[PDB]
Amino acid sequence: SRVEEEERLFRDWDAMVDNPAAAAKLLQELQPPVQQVISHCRVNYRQLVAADKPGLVLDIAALSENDLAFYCLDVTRAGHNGVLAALLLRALFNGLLQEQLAHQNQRLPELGALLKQVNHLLRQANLPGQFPLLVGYYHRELKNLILVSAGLNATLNTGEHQVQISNGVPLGTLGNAYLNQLSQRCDAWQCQIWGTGGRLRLMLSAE
Amino acid sequence: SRVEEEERLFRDWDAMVDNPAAAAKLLQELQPPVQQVISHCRVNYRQLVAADKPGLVLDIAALSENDLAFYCLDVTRAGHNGVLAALLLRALFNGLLQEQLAHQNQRLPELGALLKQVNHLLRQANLPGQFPLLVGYYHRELKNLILVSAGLNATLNTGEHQVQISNGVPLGTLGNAYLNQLSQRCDAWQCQIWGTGGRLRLMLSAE
């Protein structure tokens, strides 16, 4: 179905660019389930206010049997272009990170470099605006969590460790390098992400 | 004088182990100046309450012409052993990090590995207790700041980015790996560190 969702995102893209209602409706239908198992990890997601319109959106998916990645985007800053950016990320984000790891001999993710690539992708898709974005990577065996924020606020709790991040440089500008990085080793974590568009909660545990 | 201070720390160590008043008096005299230039960086330090007794102590020094490192230790958790640990770190911390970089082909610091080494050093110096410690690295040309906390709270402000960290695992236990890491690229930053023992402020700018 994720494979099938990728085909509808590719085939219907032009129709979604010209129909904001349809694009927003599909974006709401593509939200993660409340709980799932990804790469031997329990993953729980919920918006902290029950709403019908997309504000802060999230996607999370496996990169291999043993690691996963996620992105979180505030679509309200760029309006329709923000919704389209979320749909574009849903189609290509995981594949872009998988390609970068395929060129890294030890599969050590460079989320800052990925954000630079996403910035270029948004330009080449003709999606101007500002896109507050948070990207994360987790490996179930190494127990390593990596977080990079570009314009979003976030709290990370691992029990022994607590971090609050508030980055003010969203994606969408020409020459910003996004190099803040939080790396944390943990077996479980709870993360809350928020911006103007809303606030969500994402938690992870071993299966 | 820093070279000369290293010789008195080595020669008088045994006398300081047996005289807590002398050890604490020397520790207070070894605090950083209010402002200095280290590795082409302005460095400003102040305790946020004017006090005579050591609580949260800091040292910062160059690793080369272009980078520097610092540590911050709450000496009140282990009492006299905490004061001694600070004196031991003042003597050896910079040299230990310089040796680690000499074995890394690109001089990429591993502050988590350094903390593991410091934990072993405290054991071999026969200094039991708990030692809340924060270590930092900054490179003036790459503009990269790295922070790792083991039991201390800290806020980092770079203008575009703000981070609050509160780690609960101080040094002194047997088998803790210390792997939280904040990496941030910035030209200037202001950092406030605190624990039970007190609170200090450290800021950096280009010279």
Residue numbers in the entry:
A (entry chain A), B (entry chain A): 102 to 308
Can you provide the manuscript's text about this entry?
In the case of σs, a specialized adaptor protein RssB, also referred to as SprE, is not only required for direct recognition of the substrate but also required for its preparation and delivery to the AAA+ protease, ClpXP. RssB is a response regulator (RR), and as such is composed of an N-terminal receiver (REC) domain and a C-terminal output domain (also known as an effector domain). In contrast to most RRs (which contain a DNA binding domain) RssB is linked to a protein binding domain, and as such represents one of the small groups of RRs (~1% of all RRs). Nevertheless, like most RRs, RssB is phosphorylated on a conserved Asp residue (Asp58) within the N-terminal REC domain.
The structure of the RssBC was solved at 2.1 Å by multiple isomorphous replacement. The RssBC domain structure is a mixed α/β-fold with five α-helices and 11 β-strands and can be further divided into a mediator/connector domain (residues 131–163) connecting RssBN with RssBC and the actual C-terminal protein phosphatase (PP2C) domain (residues 164–337). The N-terminal part or connector domain of RssBC comprises three small α-helices (α6–α8) which are arranged with approximate angles of 90 degrees to each other. These helices are connected to the core domain by salt bridges, hydrogen bonds and hydrophobic interactions, but the conformation of the very first α6-helix is likely misaligned due to the absence of the structuring RssBN domain. The α8-helix connects the mediating α-helical elements with the C-proximal and structurally conserved phosphatase domain, which consists of 11 β-strands and two α-helices. The core structure of this domain is formed by a β–sandwich comprising two closely interacting β-sheets. The two β-sheets are stabilized through a hydrophobic core structure formed by conserved aromatic and aliphatic residues. Indeed, the effector domain of RssB exhibits a PPM/PP2C phosphatase fold, however it lacks the active site residues. The conserved residues (between EcRssB and PaRssB) are mostly located in the hydrophobic interface but also include two positively charged surface exposed patches, one of which is centered around the putative phosphatase site that corresponds to the peptides 90 and 91 from the peptide library and hence may play a role in docking to the ZBD of ClpX. Based on our peptide library analysis we propose that the ZBD of ClpX interacts with the α10 helix of RssB.
